[PDB]
């Protein structure tokens, strides 16, 4: 038999997902999350499909950029694993 070590396919995944363009999150779960949030401000609101798609792309872009900074922070600590505090540091530096 043949198999890889913990921490191998993860690197091939980096190459693959950096290369593609499609969404990495699922469609229906996201729609519900949007509406479940939106109803807090006002009930019965309707949405254009394009509106949801816009939200998805903005969210993915935001998170992916955040992960880049998070990754740099872990490298600065000379780790390889990312930690919640790595995220917190990057956000705080960015004024959030």
């Amino acid at each position: 038999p043949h198999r890889y070590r913990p921490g191998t396919v993860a690197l091939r995944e980096i190459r693959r997902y950096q290369k593609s363009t499609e969404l990495l999150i699922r469609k229906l779960p996201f729609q519900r999350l949007v509406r479940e949030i939106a109803q807090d401000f006002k009930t019965d609101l309707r949405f254009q499909s394009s509106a949801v798609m816009a939200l998805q792309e903005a969210c993915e872009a935001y998170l992916v950029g955040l992960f880049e900074d998070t990754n740099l922070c872990a490298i600065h600590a000379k780790r390889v694993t990312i930690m919640p505090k790595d995220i917190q540091l990057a956000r705080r530096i960015r004024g959030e």
């Binding site: 950096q18 290369k19 363009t21 792309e57 990754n71």
Partner: protein
């Protein structure tokens, strides 16, 4: 009256001077707009448009496509640090990202 001619044709531009003139007169940008103003602006927009499309065409060719798609815009823009700076806060629909891996992560 005389045999007329288009303002864009006089300037040698492809972009429509008349539309720009209307736009500048609205948006509440100013009370008044000068004659050369839309002419100068149209040339600038046309120039920057050409730069993006040229780099995007090269990017499309490297992927063996004969048609520009949003992904090729994304790569082309990032490969020119000047445009990367100008658009440093723009999100591109279906743009993807750059294939960058940090050296410390590669195996040894």
């Amino acid at each position: 009256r005389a045999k007329a001619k288009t303002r864009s044709s006089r300037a040698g531009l492809q972009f429509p001077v008349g539309r720009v003139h209307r736009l500048l007169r609205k948006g509440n940008y100013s009370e008044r707009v000068g004659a050369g103003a839309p002419v100068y602006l149209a040339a600038v927009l046309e120039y920057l448009t050409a730069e993006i499309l040229e780099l995007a065409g090269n990017a499309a060719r490297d992927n063996k496509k004969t048609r520009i798609i949003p992904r090729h815009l994304q790569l082309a823009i990032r490969n020119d640090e000047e445009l990367n700076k100008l658009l440093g806060r723009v999100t591109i629909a279906q743009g993807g990202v750059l294939p960058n891996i940090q050296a410390v992560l590669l195996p040894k």
